[PDB]
Amino acid sequence: MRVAMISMHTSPLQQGMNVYILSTATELAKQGIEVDIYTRATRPSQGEIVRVAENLRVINIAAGPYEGLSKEELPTQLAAFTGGMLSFTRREKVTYDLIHSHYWLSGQVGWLLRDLWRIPLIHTAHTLAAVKTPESEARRICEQQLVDNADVLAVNTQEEMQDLMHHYDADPDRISVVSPGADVELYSPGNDRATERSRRELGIPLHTKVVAFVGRLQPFKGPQVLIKAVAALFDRDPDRNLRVIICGGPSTYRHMAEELGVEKRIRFLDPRPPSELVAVYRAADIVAVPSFNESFGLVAMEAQASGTPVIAARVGGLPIAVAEGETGLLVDGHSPHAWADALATLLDDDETRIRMGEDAVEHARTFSWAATAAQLSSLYNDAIANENVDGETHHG
Amino acid sequence: SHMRVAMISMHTSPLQQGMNVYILSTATELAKQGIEVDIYTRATRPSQGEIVRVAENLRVINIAAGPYEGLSKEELPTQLAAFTGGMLSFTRREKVTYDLIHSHYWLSGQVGWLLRDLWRIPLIHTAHTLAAVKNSYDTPESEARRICEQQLVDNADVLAVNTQEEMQDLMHHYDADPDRISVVSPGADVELYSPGTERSRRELGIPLHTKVVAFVGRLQPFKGPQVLIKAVAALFDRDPDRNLRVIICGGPSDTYRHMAEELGVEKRIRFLDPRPPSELVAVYRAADIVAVPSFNESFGLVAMEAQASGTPVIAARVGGLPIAVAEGETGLLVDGHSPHAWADALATLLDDDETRIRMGEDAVEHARTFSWAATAAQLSSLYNDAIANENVDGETHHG
């Protein structure tokens, strides 16, 4: 398979959308899919073709000056950049099986090219005018055109799908949820003092053992499994120097915790943004993920990227997200006893647990965006299998 | 010869009532020659539908790209790819193949540039206005537009301009290669230049029973204003008491007042400062005859403006003038440039009120039918040369 990704207004080669595009493309290429990322040329020294990795290139198209053309003026270069892409493809004798365009400017480019090339257009908006003037009204119109014309609308979340339905009357049948990987730059162990800093912020002594839960507080994410497992641990041996932190949004669990006499061992933390969530993962010795359903396992990968080993239920994408015996453990089912057993084993074996947290970082870096790319590759194959483009239907 | 042209006019429809007139007038005249022209524009009026049949060989294609109203010219760049894609979709549904593209104004040129590469056919581009000429040492968006106009200067196969001044403007501001520039002269503005004359003679202080001869043009020898002056001296030699006054308008390359003084006719000849087209209507209207004693005259625009105004023309039998003037119907044609031939021709029309007035009336339809005809004739030549010398690889793209 040969994929043309389009990122007109921003190069994936500078240090959210940039890392999404680079990471997914890098991971697709690892799988043997050829990806060319097309971007406007901005850096004379890069040349036209940047060979990034096996199967992965960035193509720099001249359309307007290298500098001095702002994002707001980039619509003027829509046709020129499209023509520049086409001219490249002719000089180079390259053909593609599918286009994945990113942000509305690239969608507009990709829409023209999908008709010409007679191949599917996958489109990811990243941000939307209706979720955020004559400028913004013009952008919204273009985003609506992509809603009404692209073959697949790829969104990051269920919320994004809902924003497309509400604001753009998008057909839910054309929407596919493709979950991004863990932000491995944000979620990192930090320096030698970083875990100390996190503990201090949260008011937790350095010597205490900490188990954390992160996620929406609803029964299919199993926070009740953790709570009941903690009660069982304390029933077995009340002397644990153990605290639990649960973060933390409603879809009750404290009522549950006090019923079981563990409400002074489990603190509920309010949901917080990613930059604040790093401290939770860092302060934790173990992250427990007792999901009944888990497509994906983003929390598990955020925890591992942060250097914290994971005890996960053996469900969904969790056996992939956690390297069993290397970066954490997998639990069969959801009994409080089996969860207490796994927790005790990692809590009492410091040497193994610490090594697992250290190994978790490189595991996340190699494997978090890899599951996003498997989703994309699956979605691409389906779009191609079901491809009918005659270039005649154009809802302008 | 079998020929089909796509004209591109994204931001403005030929079907409403500047560029509009040029596009519709050139397309219409080209269609009369048996060239099939489709003018592509953004859809703005549901009632028109997709395809408008204007005349035999002439269609307007309305392409949906954004809302039919509420999208200003300034936000139109956001629809560049959508409109190009929409054009392409129409061509696939309709199964129509083109031989040449003629784009108008930078937005359409950008569309035409992509397509000319895809189809490997020439792009002829008319700017009509330019950011660098309008503005001067501007905003982020005037700058973006200028860059796009510069791309078209550096990529289009032919740059068609209205005048020599526009050619110079392209050379100065955009470093345009003069070998890629062709001057294509627009036809006479037959709305502005129309008969409506008493009011004109009051405006110009011409009283009022008198017979008047006007000259309009650059006051340089290849336009022959000296020929008229010497012809007028000869007339007054024949009849010291003749009917006649002369108005010369105007603009240096005062040779000619001193010349009129030398020949003893300075009182019967008046020199008017050049003026805008608005003001120039009055001079054509005040005149009974317009004299065009050119030695060189590619086009005959003054002749056509005079005719449109309902004033018959006496012209030298040179260049584009025997086409511009219907000889013996809307004026006279003079062989050579002797004062005596010119005095003969003047006297023939001054002394025959009935034929002169009839010629003036016939002149109006002649202009309204024939002025953009010469424009479309040079376009057809230009289009043929562009196709004969076509060299579009689809690969060279100076973005």
Side-chain angles (χ1 to χ4, degrees):
Chain A
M1 200 202 290
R2 310 154 298 186
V3 169
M5 279 196 196
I6 316 181
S7 189
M8 177 186 172
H9 75 295
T10 184
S11 180
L13 261 35
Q14 36 200 211
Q15 312 297 316
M17 139 162 45
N18 277 171
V19 340
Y20 183 106
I21 294 163
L22 220 214
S23 303
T24 56
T26 294
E27 292 299 329
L28 293 160
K30 279 196 216 306
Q31 301 183 185
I33 296 164
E34 285 185 293
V35 182
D36 291 335
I37 309 166
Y38 284 86
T39 201
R40 209 180 65 99
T42 59
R43 299 192 71 206
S45 74
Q46 277 169 357
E48 175 175 71
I49 303 168
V50 183
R51 309 188 91 80
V52 184
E54 199 185 342
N55 298 322
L56 182 60
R57 314 183 302 171
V58 178
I59 314 303
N60 297 136
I61 309 295
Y66 290 122
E67 280 138 78
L69 202 65
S70 91
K71 194 176 61 183
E72 291 68 49
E73 276 66 63
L74 290 171
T76 64
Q77 289 299 316
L78 279 165
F81 175 80
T82 304
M85 272 188 70
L86 282 160
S87 279
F88 177 81
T89 66
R90 310 188 184 103
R91 296 195 294 275
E92 297 292 319
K93 284 75 174 126
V94 295
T95 79
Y96 300 97
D97 304 302
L98 174 146
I99 305 159
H100 191 158
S101 60
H102 296 273
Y103 197 69
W104 66 278
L105 293 161
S106 298
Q108 286 288 322
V109 180
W111 178 21
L112 189 162
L113 290 176
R114 87 85 194 276
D115 278 350
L116 190 54
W117 289 339
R118 314 277 210 278
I119 55 176
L121 175 63
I122 317 300
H123 183 65
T124 304
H126 303 279
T127 60
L128 290 161
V131 178
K132 313 225 308 100
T133 60
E135 270 208 8
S136 79
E137 294 305 338
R139 165 193 177 168
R140 188 180 180 161
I141 289 159
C142 289
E143 301 180 319
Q144 180 71 59
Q145 278 170 324
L146 305 176
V147 164
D148 304 328
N149 291 271
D151 301 280
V152 181
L153 309 165
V155 300
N156 287 23
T157 59
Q158 216 63 39
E159 188 182 74
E160 280 188 28
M161 180 177 197
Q162 305 175 344
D163 286 341
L164 286 193
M165 294 173 71
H166 285 314
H167 299 289
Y168 299 85
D169 195 8
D171 188 328
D173 292 344
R174 340 263 313 174
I175 303 172
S176 187
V177 180
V178 172
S179 313
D183 182 339
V184 293
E185 264 62 48
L186 185 68
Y187 293 113
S188 61
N191 67 19
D192 63 312
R193 295 274 197 154
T195 142
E196 173 178 327
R197 255 82 258 205
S198 296
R199 288 279 175 113
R200 296 272 182 251
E201 283 181 33
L202 294 172
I204 304 164
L206 306 186
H207 52 79
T208 313
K209 301 282 173 64
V210 176
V211 177
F213 175 105
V214 175
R216 290 292 151 271
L217 299 181
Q218 59 105 349
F220 293 93
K221 298 302 153 184
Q224 75 289 359
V225 177
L226 178 58
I227 290 154
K228 283 161 172 160
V230 173
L233 277 183
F234 283 100
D235 285 341
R236 283 160 190 196
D237 168 24
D239 304 321
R240 296 280 185 182
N241 201 206
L242 200 222
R243 295 300 188 278
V244 187
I245 53 179
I246 303 182
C247 185
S251 57
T252 285
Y253 296 106
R254 199 186 300 165
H255 291 167
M256 185 177 140
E258 51 165 337
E259 194 191 346
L260 297 169
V262 289
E263 79 282 13
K264 295 101 178 181
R265 296 290 173 278
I266 307 185
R267 186 160 83 259
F268 295 88
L269 307 187
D270 293 335
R272 57 204 57 199
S275 63
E276 290 300 301
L277 219 39
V278 192
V280 175
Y281 292 128
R282 291 186 176 162
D285 297 296
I286 300 159
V287 164
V289 1
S291 305
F292 288 91
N293 309 138
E294 194 69 69
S295 69
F296 193 67
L298 177 59
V299 159
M301 272 292 190
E302 297 178 338
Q304 291 172 286
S306 294
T308 308
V310 174
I311 308 176
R314 194 182 308 276
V315 309
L318 292 171
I320 285 334
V322 177
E324 185 171 11
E326 306 177 306
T327 68
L329 305 172
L330 299 182
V331 183
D332 296 299
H334 304 83
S335 66
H337 105 71
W339 279 81
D341 286 2
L343 286 164
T345 63
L346 282 201
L347 287 164
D348 296 342
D349 187 351
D350 297 307
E351 308 69 39
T352 298
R353 184 189 67 253
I354 286 161
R355 181 183 61 249
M356 291 187 162
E358 299 169 347
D359 291 346
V361 180
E362 176 65 10
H363 181 260
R365 294 188 185 149
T366 304
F367 298 121
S368 196
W369 286 86
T372 302
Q375 293 187 327
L376 286 169
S377 156
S378 182
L379 181 67
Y380 294 172
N381 283 152
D382 291 358
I384 289 162
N386 300 316
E387 68 168 22
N388 70 326
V389 183
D390 66 3
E392 287 178 33
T393 303
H394 191 274
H395 301 305
Chain B
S1 99
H2 307 277
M3 186 159 77
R4 194 186 286 93
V5 166
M7 294 201 185
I8 310 193
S9 184
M10 173 185 181
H11 69 299
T12 185
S13 177
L15 264 30
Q16 53 189 139
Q17 346 213 213
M19 297 187 39
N20 273 185
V21 164
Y22 184 111
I23 297 161
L24 184 64
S25 306
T26 61
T28 298
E29 284 305 322
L30 287 163
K32 291 194 191 195
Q33 299 179 194
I35 298 165
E36 291 180 289
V37 182
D38 291 331
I39 309 161
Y40 284 82
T41 199
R42 212 189 58 99
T44 67
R45 279 151 90 25
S47 78
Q48 284 170 1
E50 184 180 62
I51 309 179
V52 182
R53 194 43 167 254
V54 183
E56 207 207 344
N57 302 324
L58 184 57
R59 305 188 303 175
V60 174
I61 321 298
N62 297 319
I63 305 299
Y68 280 35
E69 46 195 21
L71 194 69
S72 81
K73 188 171 63 191
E74 284 61 49
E75 278 72 58
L76 284 190
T78 67
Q79 291 296 318
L80 275 161
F83 174 81
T84 303
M87 283 191 56
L88 253 350
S89 286
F90 172 80
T91 72
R92 307 183 186 117
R93 291 188 307 268
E94 181 75 358
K95 296 178 179 290
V96 61
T97 302
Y98 295 94
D99 304 314
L100 174 141
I101 299 165
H102 191 163
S103 53
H104 298 271
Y105 194 66
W106 66 282
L107 291 158
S108 301
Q110 289 291 326
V111 172
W113 174 24
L114 183 153
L115 297 170
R116 82 87 195 267
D117 278 356
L118 171 58
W119 290 334
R120 299 186 52 201
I121 59 180
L123 177 62
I124 314 305
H125 179 75
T126 306
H128 300 281
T129 56
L130 287 166
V133 175
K134 290 186 61 207
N135 314 308
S136 167
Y137 185 73
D138 36 40
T139 57
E141 64 147 65
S142 67
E143 220 55 61
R145 170 185 171 179
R146 189 182 177 158
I147 288 149
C148 279
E149 296 170 337
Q150 186 67 63
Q151 289 175 314
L152 303 179
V153 161
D154 297 337
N155 295 272
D157 301 282
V158 180
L159 306 167
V161 297
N162 286 29
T163 64
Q164 283 285 319
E165 183 178 87
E166 211 202 326
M167 187 177 191
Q168 310 192 347
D169 283 342
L170 252 23
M171 293 173 66
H172 285 142
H173 295 297
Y174 299 87
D175 198 358
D177 185 342
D179 292 324
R180 276 168 193 72
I181 302 165
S182 305
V183 184
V184 176
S185 170
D189 189 336
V190 305
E191 196 178 41
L192 181 80
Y193 296 109
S194 42
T197 165
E198 166 189 287
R199 297 146 185 253
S200 295
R201 296 219 178 172
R202 304 287 215 273
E203 284 182 3
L204 305 175
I206 300 160
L208 175 276
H209 70 275
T210 192
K211 279 155 187 194
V212 6
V213 173
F215 171 107
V216 170
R218 328 196 289 253
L219 298 188
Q220 55 106 163
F222 295 85
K223 292 307 165 203
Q226 72 287 1
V227 176
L228 182 62
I229 297 170
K230 295 159 173 173
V232 174
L235 279 170
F236 285 116
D237 287 322
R238 296 166 186 194
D239 193 353
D241 291 350
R242 168 167 288 271
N243 74 39
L244 167 72
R245 298 286 185 275
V246 175
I247 53 188
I248 295 174
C249 180
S253 197
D254 44 347
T255 287
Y256 305 105
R257 213 145 216 174
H258 295 74
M259 175 170 153
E261 296 182 19
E262 203 195 359
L263 300 170
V265 289
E266 75 279 3
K267 263 69 185 196
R268 308 280 171 253
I269 299 192
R270 213 164 95 241
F271 293 92
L272 318 187
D273 299 357
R275 52 249 269 149
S278 303
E279 298 315 314
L280 198 71
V281 186
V283 23
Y284 292 126
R285 287 193 184 169
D288 290 302
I289 307 163
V290 168
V292 185
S294 299
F295 288 86
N296 315 138
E297 191 70 71
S298 309
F299 191 72
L301 182 61
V302 164
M304 210 65 76
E305 288 173 346
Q307 285 176 105
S309 297
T311 304
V313 167
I314 307 173
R317 181 174 258 107
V318 310
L321 287 163
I323 284 176
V325 177
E327 183 176 8
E329 323 211 318
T330 64
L332 303 172
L333 295 170
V334 187
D335 284 284
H337 293 86
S338 69
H340 309 101
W342 275 85
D344 287 346
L346 291 157
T348 292
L349 287 196
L350 292 164
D351 293 342
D352 187 354
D353 296 332
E354 134 134 58
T355 300
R356 201 194 53 251
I357 280 146
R358 188 52 193 280
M359 277 178 178
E361 296 159 340
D362 293 349
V364 311
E365 185 52 34
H366 179 75
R368 300 193 184 165
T369 302
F370 281 49
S371 203
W372 284 86
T375 307
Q378 67 201 155
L379 282 174
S380 169
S381 294
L382 186 56
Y383 296 169
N384 285 347
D385 289 11
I387 293 166
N389 296 123
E390 78 190 342
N391 195 35
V392 178
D393 62 11
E395 283 175 37
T396 305
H397 183 279
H398 307 294

